[PDB]
Design a protein around this nucleic acid. Structure first.
Ligand code: MG
Ligand code: ZN
Lengths: 44, 25, 155, 40, 80, 179, 168, 38, 146, 138
RNA sequence: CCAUAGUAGGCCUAAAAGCAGCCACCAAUUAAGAAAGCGUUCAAGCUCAAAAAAAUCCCAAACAUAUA
């Protein structure tokens, strides 16, 4: 299970690093959306 | 006229210790 | 329209739903007003036009249902308020068991504000800064006028 | 108005009537012709 | 308050009023409280029968009814 | 060490300096002319620093430190003259307009002259609409034509500066609605 | 007299004020208002990766899984959801749920077209590779309130009344 | 009721109305949130 | 406020006890104390400030615990940690929750260790409450006068 | 009702007393149930569990697998977690053995790891592990 | 438009389980934040994703609609 063993470690991939059309790219996008939405919510 | 039922954490209201800087007129 | 009646058996019936006149004068008019070439051509007086846009009890129908132009929708509700206050809608009174007490009658028209809502003008200002009493609506500014003198909205 | 109604820091405001605008347009379009005839 | 039975036909013409009424009454928050009451859905114009213990049969045709109108009428009958 | 006679001419007229976006998307555009005190700057630094983290977003002082003296019955303090159009404070980084506008316009509210927090896009937008409005006009008569031609003998009433001012400036005040 | 620059708005000479009145901006108004006129059709939309990805999965789940069993989302509690999920995991049948609005476009132009009336409101799909219809109906009988709207088994479209007799 | 020139929200429960020709803010959870236009 | 979960009654609670001679004796209830408490473990010993003014102490001990005799030892140790004279200050030891059979079982060893002087009580059933009231009054008349 | 017990396998039920007894419970029954699954499993391990309690006074204990958090430092020979909670190296856990233990974790539907990619499981574990100030080598 | 869960994220605490504080903020599915605001001792339960005030008594009367 060499290929299965092969896995990314350390930092998660940013939008710049990441290739779009990826499933988890859109997960990250919505994460970021709700993050900055929550960040602006505190002010009001 | 009725007294409001109190929460267990009423230490929020009740204070036993306070540092006060008093200044005269 | 849908009606609900109690006998128990309750159900909805499409009893009677009216339809729009077959030949619109200006097709491609997005508004129902813009369609019939009425844009700046009615005020509070024109109750027949306004009767088509209101619920039986006197309240007004929403934009999505009535299909109204956004800018136009504000005009009708303003005209209808004035229409009510003038007393041109006696069959669209508010909905009971209790009887309303005898109240003074004062004939009014072109009434901008709710009549229990305006504080009396005790001290009016100087000539150069006088406090004036509103008449009619600003939304009705752009209506067709047949006189040189524009609509005086403040008295 | 404390002092004179026309002069000083504080004074009773004036406003341009529709007639006073109309009058001024009449004068401006007269000198518009004047410009033309002194052009050639 | 005793029994409720609902008939709706997705095979035939589809009306969502009774259909939406299902998930309103299939909630735990209502089912746990009304443990005495029993709910059954049937799939084959839609029919709602409420069999009260008070000797009342609430019969409702959910064709020309509003989603929430269904609930309001039911509420008025059960609460009394 | 020199005292200056109060030359109010500095506040008059459009800003020709620091009217360019520099390594920043968001800035506060001055809509009027006034003198900034040190107190203003104190508030500026405090509010901006406490609002957004400097690691992700950066703020730039686009206005010089106060140096115009004020004489009071002898010189007491220093002020900064600003004409209408100067970007007072620049802001840049990986950020959005919607989330910055809030504190930015709030900070601009306290300013002695009228001002607006604007992006690059929004600033350029309003420049475009103004210059569209002037060619779009349905009035034959502009202040420009009359003033320059000396049409009604209007120069008797007008100032020499008015010809340059296009009638858009009146004292320390800038009128954007004026064409 | 006063200075040319003031802290307050200076009062103008009347002549100058008359000038300001005359040289005001006039906006052009068209004979026919542009908002009331029919709009040009909107420029064609850009297909987002979201709907493209979703496109792939729904196409895949329909093509690969021979049977699709449509049942109304009954909003069952997590406590009661687990047992159903575990029962189906033992029977190697998995659950699929999608928004109705994004489900519509496919069902417009596919092998399955007649399920568009079925797919109104909240709905989930029982998908497998084996036609264990008996197991599906068996676990359905457990909860009376929960209905089955039908769907298709072995690429043949049918409702509940057909599915019950097919189970044998 | 607190007199405020500009009216704000302090809650989700908090709601605006126009009564007697002025804006008000009413609040059932926290009646301290009440505001009156001046 | 009374509940099964520990660390209740955070605020000190005063109730007075009426008597026939038109005199009132005030009794204070403070939150639970723990062995240590000098390292601010638990709720600490901050609430102990009231007890300085209190003329005498009520050592309330639960019999649910296997060794209730060690309870008073821990209490006297922690009071000493706060203030030296508090340990030497006069008191009464009161046992609670005796309606439970395990308390009745451990009662014998309580008599062995603590002695007869300790008064045994139930709060829920109000068992032997009267002896408490006698003891409260007697301690008052002893060293709360002059 | 949902009830969670995070107690070592070789340990009995007093704090759980009020927590579970707020609805009135035979605590002895729960203790017996918990201690029954201690003997068959390897000794010296905590057993975080997810018990279910129905209103008809019935127990539905789900033993499943202990928390991943423990399993990060379990085979290391240390019994203390990350105080710093990141930005540090406290666990010198070998990546090879980390892979091995990650593989031997996902065998239960209690954790609801129904994903056929074991690679997806391990990267989720890495996401868990980054919370702790640990490191993986070789 | 909306569901579960690695997970009471961990540490400090007598317990802080999303919400005492601090650090990390990744990550399963296809389908929301190691949670933006409520609520619990802790849990459980909820939601969200456009200004003006003073002193004898307000101060023309009035009016929106007949073609410069
Ligand atoms: Mg939201
Ligand atoms: Zn509120």
């Amino acid at each position: 299970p060499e290929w299965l063993f092969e896995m990314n470690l350390g930092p998660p991939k940013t939008l710049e690093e990441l290739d779009p059309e990826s499933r988890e790219y859109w997960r990250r996008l919505r994460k970021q959306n709700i993050w900055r939405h929550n960040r602006l919510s505190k002010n009001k | 006229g009725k007294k409001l039922l109190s929460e267990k954490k009423l230490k929020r209201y009740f204070v036993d210790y306070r540092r006060v800087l008093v200044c005269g007129g | 329209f849908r009606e609900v009646v109690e006998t128990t058996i309750i159900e909805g019936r499409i009893t009677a739903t009216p339809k729009e006149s077959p030949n619109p004068p200006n097709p491609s008019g997005q508004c129902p007003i813009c369609r019939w070439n009425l844009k700046h051509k009615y005020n509070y007086d024109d109750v027949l036009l306004l009767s088509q846009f209101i619920r039986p009890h006197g309240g007004m129908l929403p934009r999505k249902i009535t299909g109204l132009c956004q800018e136009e929708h504000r005009k009708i509700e303003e005209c209808v308020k004035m229409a009510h206050r003038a007393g041109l809608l006696p069959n669209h009174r508010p909905r009971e068991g209790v009887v309303p007490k005898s109240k003074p009658q004062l004939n009014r028209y072109l009434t901008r504000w709710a009549p229990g809502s305006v504080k009396p003008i005790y001290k009016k200002g100087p000539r150069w800064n006088r406090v004036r009493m509103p008449v009619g609506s600003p939304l009705l500014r752009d209506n067709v006028c047949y006189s040189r003198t524009p609509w005086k909205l403040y008295h | 108005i404390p002092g004179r109604q026309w002069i000083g820091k504080h004074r009773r405001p004036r406003f341009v009537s529709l007639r006073a605008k109309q009058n001024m347009i009449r004068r401006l379009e007269i000198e518009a012709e004047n410009h033309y005839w002194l052009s050639m | 308050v005793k029994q409720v039975r609902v008939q709706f036909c997705p095979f035939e013409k589809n009306v969502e009023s009774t259909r939406t009424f299902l998930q309103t009454v299939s909630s735990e928050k209502v089912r746990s409280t009304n443990l005495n009451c029993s709910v059954i859905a049937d799939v084959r114009e839609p029919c709602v029968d409420v069999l009260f213990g008070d000797g009342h049969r609430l019969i409702m045709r959910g064709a020309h009814l509003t989603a929430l109108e269904m609930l309001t009428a039911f509420a008025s009958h059960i609460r009394a | 060490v020199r005292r200056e006679p109060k030359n109010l001419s500095d506040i008059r007229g459009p800003s020709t300096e620091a009217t360019e976006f520099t390594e920043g998307n968001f800035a506060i555009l001055a809509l009027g002319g006034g003198y900034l005190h040190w107190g203003h700057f104190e508030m500026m630094r405090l509010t901006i620093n406490r609002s957004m983290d400097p690691k992700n977003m950066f703020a730039i002082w686009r206005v010089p430190a106060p140096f115009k003296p004020i004489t009071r019955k002898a010189i007491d303090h220093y002020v900064t003259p600003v004409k209408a159009g100067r970007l007072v404070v620049e802001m840049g980084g990986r950020c959005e307009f919607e989330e910055v506008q809030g504190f930015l316009d709030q900070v601009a509210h306290k300013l002695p002259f009228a001002a607006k927090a604007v992006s690059r896009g929004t600033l350029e937008k309003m420049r475009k609409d103004q210059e569209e409005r002037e060619r779009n006009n349905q009035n034959p008569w502009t202040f420009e034509r009359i003033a320059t031609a000396n049409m009604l003998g209007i120069r008797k009433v007008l100032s020499p500066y008015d010809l340059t001012h296009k009638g858009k400036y009146w004292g320390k005040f800038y009128m954007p609605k004026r064409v | 007299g006063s200075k040319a620059v003031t802290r307050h708005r200076r009062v103008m000479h009347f002549q100058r004020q008359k000038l300001m009145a005359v040289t005001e901006y006039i906006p052009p108004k068209p004979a026919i208002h542009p908002s009331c006129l029919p709009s040009p059709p909107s420029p064609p939309q850009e297909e987002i990766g979201l709907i493209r990805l979703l496109r792939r999965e729904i196409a895949a789940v329909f093509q690969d899984n021979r049977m699709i069993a449509v049942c109304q989302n009954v909003a069952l509690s997590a406590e009661d959801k687990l047992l159903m999920r575990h029962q189906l995991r033992k029977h190697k049948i998995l659950m699929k749920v999608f928004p109705n609005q994004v489900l519509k476009p496919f069902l417009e132009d596919s092998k399955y077209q007649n399920l568009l009336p079925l797919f109104v409101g909240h709905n989930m799909l029982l998908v497998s590779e084996e036609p264990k219809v008996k197991e599906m109906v068996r676990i359905l009988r457990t909860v009376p309130f929960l209905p089955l709207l039908g769907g298709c088994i072995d690429d043949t479209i049918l409702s509940r009344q057909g599915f019950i007799n097919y189970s044998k | 009721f607190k007199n405020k020139t500009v009216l704000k929200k302090r809650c989700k429960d908090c709601y605006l109305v126009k009564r007697r020709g002025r804006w008000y803010v009413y609040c059932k959870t926290h009646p301290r949130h009440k505001q009156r236009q001046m | 406020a009374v509940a099964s979960y520990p660390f209740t009654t955070l605020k000190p609670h005063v109730g007075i006890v009426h008597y026939e001679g038109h005199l009132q004796i005030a009794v204070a209830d403070i939150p639970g104390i723990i062995r240590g408490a000098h390292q601010n473990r638990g709720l600490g010993s901050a609430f102990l400030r009231h007890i300085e003014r209190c003329r005498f102490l009520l050592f309330v001990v639960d019999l649910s615990q296997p060794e209730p005799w060690t309870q008073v030892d821990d209490l006297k140790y922690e009071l000493e940690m706060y203030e030296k004279g508090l340990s030497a200050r006069p008191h009464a030891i009161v046992a609670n929750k005796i309606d439970l059979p395990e308390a009745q079982a451990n009662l014998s060893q309580l008599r062995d260790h603590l002695g007869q002087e300790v008064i045994v009580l139930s709060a829920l059933t109000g068992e032997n409450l009267e002896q408490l009231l006698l003891h409260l009054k007697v301690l008052y008349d002893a060293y709360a006068e002059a | 009702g949902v009830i969670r017990a995070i107690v070592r396998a070789g340990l009995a039920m007093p704090p759980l007393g009020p927590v579970l007894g707020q609805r009135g419970v035979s605590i002895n029954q729960f203790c017996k149930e918990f201690n029954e699954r201690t003997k068959d499993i390897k000794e010296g391990i905590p057993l975080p569990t997810k018990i279910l309690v129905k209103p008809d006074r019935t127990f539905e204990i789900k033993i499943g697998q202990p928390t991943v958090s423990y399993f990060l430092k379990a085979a290391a020979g240390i019994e203390k977690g990350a105080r710093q909670t990141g930005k540090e190296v406290a666990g010198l856990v070998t990546l090879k053995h980390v892979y091995e233990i990650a593989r031997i974790k996902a065998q239960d539907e209690a954790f609801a790891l129904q994903d056929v990619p074991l690679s997806s499981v391990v990267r989720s574990i890495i996401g868990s592990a980054r919370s702790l100030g640990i490191r993986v080598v070789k």
